[PDB]
Design a protein around this ligand. Structure first.
Ligand SMILES: *[C@@H]1O[C@H](CO)[C@@H](O[C@@H]2O[C@H](CO)[C@@H](O[C@@H]3O[C@H](CO)[C@@H](O)[C@H](O[C@H]4O[C@H](CO)[C@@H](O)[C@H](O)[C@@H]4O)[C@@H]3O)[C@H](O)[C@H]2NC(C)=O)[C@H](O)[C@H]1NC(C)=O
Ligand SMILES: *[C@@H]1O[C@H](CO)[C@@H](O[C@@H]2O[C@H](CO)[C@@H](O)[C@H](O)[C@H]2NC(C)=O)[C@H](O)[C@H]1NC(C)=O
Length: 331
């Protein structure tokens, strides 16, 4: 039994906050990954979006005798954290709970990371409940916070700044973000990879057309944070940490550079990365930055290219976990 801890605040407050928790489970063989279904015995209202079938290009490597053979094909996965637009943003109002997983994989095995997001009211209704994923049971524990006004962060009770203007103590908090595909008809407002390129590039990249955004939750509970929100200091912070740690923040053995075709029907290579063996470390899921219409990739045993300074064959991860410093008061 794994443990997914939810830190519950003393009050609901302004209504629009969500709780979030997550746990990384033990390795399962690859052949079992396509069968994985999240089950819930919990007394909450599961959003059905994530358990539908979702098309991915599977990209894999084998030793050959540069010394690699890669290949790819299109498959359907279910239960992954591909959250539709507005679902997280309006979950406090709809009273919907999002439960989904990401995959961190080597060639032969995957560690699912289960994410649970939902309304703060769940803390009134629920002390503990169970999720299942394949053969693993997950104990969700809702636990009331030691603090009076904030959250337990690095063993310290902390409340961040709230005002919209400019004016403190500084505490480093966890941020968890989910990639959302969202197109507009006209212009470049949703061209997410262009935002990264302005932050970390010298010269002009021609074709990074992916349209979407990240939706993030800060700490154990917060209102959703949209990335990018141009004049928000927290958005700026998350983007900068993403730009320097594109596979998130926290033995794996690097073998070499690999390329491949995504989707597999492409005549030439559209993706690159670094093949590895040993313990999976980063998530193995992302989207090509080059296509407006998302091309989703699952690349077990390969760290797909996420360096924003590169122009071609790069990706954005489906989920991203890191840390940002927040100004506020320790109490
Ligand atoms: C992908 O990652 C997975 C998980 O990280 C990894 O598979 C695991 O590898 C370890 C070690 O390579 C396996 O450990 C074995 O566990 C059994 C359980 O009873 C032990 O009995 C074994 O012990 C013997 O082997 C050791 C070899 O050094 C000795 O020190 C020891 O005294 C024993 O003789 C053994 O350690 C584990 O079972 C698997 N896990 C899974 C889920 O299959 C895998 O190697 C990674 N894949 C790649 C391609 O890198
Ligand atoms: C991210 O990508 C850029 C461009 O490929 C890499 O920048 C080069 O890095 C080498 C060694 O650090 C330098 O000698 C080159 O002059 C750099 N070129 C440019 C255009 O900046 C960068 O190292 C990559 N970051 C990684 C792999 O972490």
């Amino acid at each position: 039994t794994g443990e997914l801890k939810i830190e519950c605040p003393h009050t609901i407050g302004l209504g629009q906050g969500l709780v979030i928790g997550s746990v990384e489970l033990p390795p399962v063989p690859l052949t079992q990954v396509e069968s994985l279904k999240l089950e819930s015995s919990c007394n909450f209202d599961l959003h059905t979006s994530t358990s539908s079938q979702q098309p991915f290009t599977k990209w894999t490597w084998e030793m050959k005798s540069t010394s690699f053979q890669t290949k790819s094909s299109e498959i359907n996965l279910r239960g992954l954290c591909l959250v539709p637009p507005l679902v997280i943003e309006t979950a406090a109002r709809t009273r919907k709970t999002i439960a989904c997983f990401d995959l961190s994989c080597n060639q032969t095995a995957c560690q699912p990371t289960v994410f649970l997001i939902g309304p703060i009211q769940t803390c009134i209704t629920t002390k503990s409940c169970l999720l299942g994923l394949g053969d693993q049971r997950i104990q969700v524990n809702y636990e009331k916070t030691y603090c009076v006004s904030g959250q337990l962060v690095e063993g310290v009770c902390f409340n961040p700044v709230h005002t919209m203007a400019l004016s403190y103590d500084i505490v480093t908090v966890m941020v968890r973000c989910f990639l959302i595909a969202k197109k507009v008809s006209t212009g470049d407002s949703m061209k997410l990879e262009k935002s990264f390129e302005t932050l970390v590039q010298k010269t002009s990249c021609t074709g990074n057309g992916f349209q979407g955004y990240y939706i993030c939750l800060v700490g154990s509970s917060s209102e959703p944070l949209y990335i990018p929100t141009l004049d928000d200091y927290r958005s700026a912070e998350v983007l900068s940490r993403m730009a320097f740690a594109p596979h998130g923040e926290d033995a794996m053995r690097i073998i070499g550079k690999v390329t491949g075709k995504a989707p597999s029907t492409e005549s030439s290579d559209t993706i690159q990365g670094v093949a590895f063996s040993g313990n999976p470390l980063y998530t193995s899921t992302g989207v090509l930055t080059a296509k407006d219409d998302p091309v989703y990739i699952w690349a077990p045993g390969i760290i797909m290219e996420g360096n924003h300074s590169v122009c071609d064959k790069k990706t954005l991860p489906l989920t991203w976990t890191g840390f940002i410093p927040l100004p506020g008061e320790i109490e």
